[PDB]
Design a protein around this nucleic acid. Structure first.
Ligand SMILES: [Mg+2]
Length: 529
RNA sequence: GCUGGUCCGA
RNA sequence: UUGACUAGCC
RNA sequence: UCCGA
């Protein structure tokens, strides 16, 4: 009895034809939320992968778990546990469409909390448009009109003014489009002004409010909207700098000619929101606004390493990782990556995760480096082995008693250590992918060598394909031969529906890579909590 | 007063 | 933007 | 496709 044979009737064949278990639908939902389906996997094509997860979603709704789905989507969104928004928004769109009335109602109820910025709302609505044929249903019923109307009417006019000028339109939709389709009725004078600005433009608003009496709050909105117009009618460096300071305008408010100015950037740097700062490190370095040993460089490092703000702004470790890698590249533009910035990014990476108190148990961390793990993740340049290595570094730095190992169809030494800097672990890992997949190795190896481990964490895509015993079986053998209640945590690295964890074994757990809140689930499972 | 749906955006 | 239609609710 | 702590 080996992997090419089913262990029981509950097992199904994976992409290689070997037998594993079907991961639960709620668990597959989480994998989807964290990895999406873009780029598909080594075995499944993008489109097919998308349909598979969409199928699982519909199955959840059909099984009457639609409200649990929405709750899970909302939780991931609010806590920022997922690197990208597309998957959560696509899922919310499905739930808001054709689902049972309860599911649909919970979904729209979650719109304000899930769609925080215009880009989210625009993307959500576009997916509902794409789902319009496949789900045989229209989208502009009273519920969507109401949800969109509330999105605008429950917001402070001045804040909305910032939102509609910074994000005029994204992913196919503009605010004008939404107002036209929602037929919103402004809830106050500030909203009416903004609605008028979005629908007819500045000139219209100006003529509409001339000789008109306005509260002091409305006056603020008018002045702000005017500033966004004024900044586009001048090439004077100082006037722009003063408007930025005065109205806290951001990069999105400026013209191309303005972004060539080192001084405009320095003033832009003053109150640059966190994500924008992270993504423009390369640009500002090339322009010398982030000069070596400068005062800006030092300021930037302090912002990137402040755990409180990283959480507040919902900065995800994967964003940190991607930024780190491209910044280190030194080209995108050409620049000398600042070593202090590079060190701060490494530091922020770990801080971006939801940290927890250590358990003090013995962990054996095994990274799957088989050929399939060369698959790209989240449309980035980083493969699954690289991403999993980053997760291992996280766990290894949380649990002092951690041992890292690698494997394909044979055990291999791990070329990374707990003291390395992230960019270094990345370089040491993108040449390792090779060979077949034997997911039972870690447990078999530990037994053979008498290595004591309380927890086995295996980072893989669960596409095991060697004529060796089932990993579940290897785990059972380890428990008996070593006299240790070892547990296996399967850290999924894709959104396929396969798992080597035995559903009937309370000692085996399914979770997925780069869920910024995964360290919490691991701690609870480990401590039997 | 309210909430489901069809149409109306680009 | 500040709907049309339709189905229904208090 | 740039989440104002
Ligand atoms: Mg493989």
């Amino acid at each position: 009895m080996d992997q090419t044979q089913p262990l029981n009737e509950k097992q199904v064949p994976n992409s290689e034809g070997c037998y594993v278990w079907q991961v639960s639908d709620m668990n597959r939902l989480r994998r989807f939320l964290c990895f999406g389906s873009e780029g598909g996997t080594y075995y499944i094509e993008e489109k097919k992968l998308g349909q598979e997860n969409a199928e699982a979603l519909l199955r959840l709704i059909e099984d009457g778990k639609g409200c649990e789905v929405v709750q899970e989507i909302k939780t991931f969104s609010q806590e920022g546990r997922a690197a990208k928004q597309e998957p959560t928004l696509f899922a919310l769109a499905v739930c808001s469409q054709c689902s049972d009335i309860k599911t649909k109602q919970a979904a729209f109820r979650a719109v304000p909390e899930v769609c925080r910025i215009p880009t989210h709302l625009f993307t959500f609505i576009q997916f509902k448009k794409d789902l319009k044929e496949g789900m045989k249903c229209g989208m502009w019923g009273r519920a969507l009109r109401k949800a969109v109307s509330d999105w605008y009417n429950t917001k402070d006019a001045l804040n909305l003014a910032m939102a509609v000028t910074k994000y005029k339109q994204r992913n196919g939709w503009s605010h004008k489009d939404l107002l036209r389709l929602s037929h919103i009725k402004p809830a106050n004078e500030g909203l009416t002004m903004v609605a008028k600005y979005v629908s007819k433009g500045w000139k219209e608003v100006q003529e509409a409010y001339k000789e008109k009496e306005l509260s002091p709050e409305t006056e603020k909105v008018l002045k702000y909207l005017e500033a966004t117009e004024r900044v586009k009618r001048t090439k004077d460096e100082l006037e722009i700098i003063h408007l930025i300071d005065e109205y806290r305008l951001v990069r999105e408010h400026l013209l191309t000619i303005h972004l060539k100015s080192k001084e405009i950037w320095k003033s832009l740097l003053q109150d640059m929101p966190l994500t924008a700062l992270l993504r423009n490190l390369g640009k500002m370095t090339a322009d010398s606004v982030l000069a070596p040993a400068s005062s800006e460089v030092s300021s930037v490092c302090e912002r990137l390493t402040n755990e409180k703000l990283l959480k507040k702004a919902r900065i995800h470790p994967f964003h940190i990782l991607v930024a780190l890698e491209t910044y280190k590249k030194g080209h995108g533009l050409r620049w000398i990556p600042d070593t202090s910035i590079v060190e701060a990014l490494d530091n922020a990476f770990y801080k971006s995760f939801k940290l927890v108190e250590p358990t003090g148990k013995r962990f054996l961390l095994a990274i799957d480096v088989s050929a399939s793990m060369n698959q790209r993740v989240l449309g980035s340049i980083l493969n699954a082995s690289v991403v999993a290595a980053a997760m291992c570094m996280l766990v290894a730095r949380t649990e002092k008693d951690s041992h890292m190992v690698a494997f394909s169809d044979e055990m291999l030494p791990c070329p990374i250590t707990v003291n390395m800097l992230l960019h270094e672990v990345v370089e040491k890992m993108s040449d390792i992918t090779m060979g077949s997949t034997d997911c039972a190795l870690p447990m078999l190896w530990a037994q053979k060598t008498n290595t004591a481990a309380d927890i086995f964490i295996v980072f893989t895509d669960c596409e095991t394909n060697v004529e060796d015993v089932h990993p579940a079986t290897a785990l059972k053998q380890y428990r008996e031969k070593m006299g240790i209640p070892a547990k296996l945590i399967v850290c999924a690295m894709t959104s396929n529906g396969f798992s080597i964890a035995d559903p009937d074994d309370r000692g085996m757990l399914d979770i997925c890579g780069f869920d910024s809140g995964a360290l919490d689930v691991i701690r609870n499972f480990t401590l039997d909590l």
